[PDB]
């Protein structure tokens, strides 16, 4: 997250870290046995880490559970990143408590102008590199459809939305993929892609979760 602040230990209880020997993507806990992340984050042998703040230090509230299976969306396109969503089933159910909790699925799509919360352990610099040890947070509004398409001509589909600032300076970044965009207590987005990080007129692009609610509900209940 570039231009953000520090969330505070366990204040974003649904945030998880996908680990393959190292943190590479984020995710969102939707129920005791399921996590939603981005399809481009797929890897075999993923270990999900819940209740984390400082990813380097063991603080006592962590839960490390292996992924039992990963379902990539049937129409995911790795070239265009269309339908960039994936479901990960945990090998064992996570113990829910004050530090580990699920986030609600939306009933309707969010409108332009709505303030959302984006979080992750990704790069904190637009130029260069700096990876945080503690979870970072960013408050950003959903941008209008027109703004998004003009920023990325011919690259925005109906399953994507832009969130951020056209002035640049604040945005999600590498290492934030698969993480949550929560608006009004509901999971509206998934960190997906962008052109650089926090660049002028180049806001982040997120997977529009409201278009996948029935698919998610069906999958979770059938596996």
């Amino acid at each position: 997250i570039v231009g953000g602040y520090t969330c505070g230990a366990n204040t974003v209880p649904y945030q998880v870290s996908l680990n393959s020997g190292y943190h590479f993507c984020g995710g969102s806990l939707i129920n005791s046995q399921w996590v939603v992340s981005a399809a481009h984050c797929y890897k075999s042998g993923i270990q999900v880490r819940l209740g984390e703040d400082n990813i380097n230090v063991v603080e006592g509230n962590e839960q490390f559970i292996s992924a039992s299976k990963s379902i990539v969306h049937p129409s995911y396109n790795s070239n265009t990143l269309n339908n960039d969503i994936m479901l990960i089933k945990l090998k064992s159910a996570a113990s829910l408590n004050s530090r580990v909790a699920s986030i609600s699925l939306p009933t309707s799509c969010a409108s332009a102008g709505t303030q959302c919360l984006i979080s992750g352990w990704g790069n904190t610099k637009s130029s260069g590199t700096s990876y945080p040890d503690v979870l970072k947070c960013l408050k950003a509004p959903i941008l209008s459809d027109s703004s998004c398409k003009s920023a990325y001509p011919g690259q925005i589909t109906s399953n994507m939305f832009c969130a951020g600032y056209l002035e640049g300076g604040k945005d999600s970044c590498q290492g934030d993929s698969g993480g949550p965009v929560v608006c009004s207590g509901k999971l509206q987005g998934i960190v997906s892609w962008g052109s650089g990080c926090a660049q002028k007129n180049k806001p982040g692009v997120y997977t529009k979760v409201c278009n996948y609610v029935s698919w998610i509900k069906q999958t979770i209940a059938s596996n």
Partner: peptide, 28 residues
Amino acid sequence: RICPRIWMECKRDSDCMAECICVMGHCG
């Protein structure tokens, strides 16, 4: 360009995903 926000190490541009490039050892 289209560059996924996944953390990934690299030795050359070709190691990265989609239109991401290897900027000093990290895809971006």
